[PDB]
């Protein structure tokens, strides 16, 4: 089912501090090597009054390098696909919730992303656009209630040094019954390779490989 090189196509719709936006994206990656690229075009709500980094983790764990001794909950979930529900709690009470229904047909992955954000302070790093990048991270994967849960202590480096903390909690739900893995970790690194003046156009890179402690 999952080809060694899979094309990506998506559409994110949402609101941050009540600001409606729509972002379409087309990308390409290698799911077995755990890397992928995505070119994102802001279709609606441009210019964005908030930092683009807060959207980057919502823009697919199928694009993870999985060893043999660790069942791949994500790749096994296909052709049908899976879906995820994510909460992202910032240290300044600014909170985001996101969802994605991931489907497939041919060599292309398809996503429908819903992202909602609120209670970000006007003079904070997000709304003032003071965020430079997400520090690299490790997501703790464990099975709960028959589905896969993931937790990651995220942190955005800011303009002028210092970090901006976020607590991520995700629930991955396979559309079919699959072999549930035993608890593991996912080392990740997401980075915006290139962008324009207001991030109307963005190239985004991700690298993630799963392992045991």
Numbering used by the authors: 3 to 61, 65 to 218
Sentences from the paper on this structure:
eCGP123 is a bright green FP engineered for extreme stability, and was developed using a two-step process. Phanta was isolated by expression screening of a library targeting amino acid positions 62/63/65/69 and 191/192/193 in the bright green fluorescent protein eCGP123. Phanta contains the substitutions Gln62Met, Thr69Val and His193Gln. The protomers in each protein are typical of the GFP-superfamily and consist of an 11-stranded β-barrel (or β-can) with two small helices forming interconnecting loops protecting the chromophore from bulk solvent.
The absorbance spectrum of eCGP123T69V showed a major absorbing species at 506 nm whilst eCGP123H193Q contained significant amounts of a 387 nm species in addition to the 506 nm species. In the case of eCGP123H193Q titration above pH 8 did not diminish the amount of the protonated form, suggesting that two distinct populations of the chromophore exist, only one of which can be titrated for pH. The results show that under violet light illumination recovery of the ON state for CGP123H193Q driven was minor, whereas thermally induced recovery of the ON state (no illumination) was near complete after 35 mins incubation at 25°C. The conversion OFF to ON rates for Phanta, eCGP123, eCGP123H193Q and eCGP123T69V were determined and are similar. These results suggest that photoswitching of eCGP123H193Q into the ON state is inefficient. The spectral data obtained for eCGP123H193Q suggest the possibility that both the protonated and anionic chromophore are present in the structure but only a single chromophore species appears to be represented in the structural data. However, electron density corresponding to the 4-hyroxybenzyl ring in protomers of both the weakly fluorescent eCGP123H193Q (ΦF, 0.004) and strongly fluorescent eCGP123T69V (ΦF, 0.32) is well defined, indicating a rigid chromophore, and suggesting that a mobile chromophore is not responsible for poor fluorescence emission of eCGP123H193Q. In Phanta and eCGP123H193Q the imidazole ring of His193 is substituted by the polar side chain of a glutamine leaving the chromophore with a reduced number of stabilising interactions. In Phanta and eCGP123H193Q, Glu215 no longer interacts with the side chain of Gln193 that replaces the histidine at position 193. Instead a hydrogen bond is formed between the Nδ1 of Gln193 and the Oγ of Ser142, which in turn forms a hydrogen bond with Oη of the chromophore. In eCGP123H193Q contact between Glu144 and Arg66 is maintained through a water-mediated (H2O783) hydrogen bond. Collectively these data suggest that the very low fluorescence efficiency of Phanta and eCGP123H193Q is a result of removing the stabilising effects of π-π interactions between His193 and the chromophore in the excited state, together with alterations to the scaffold extending around the chromophore.
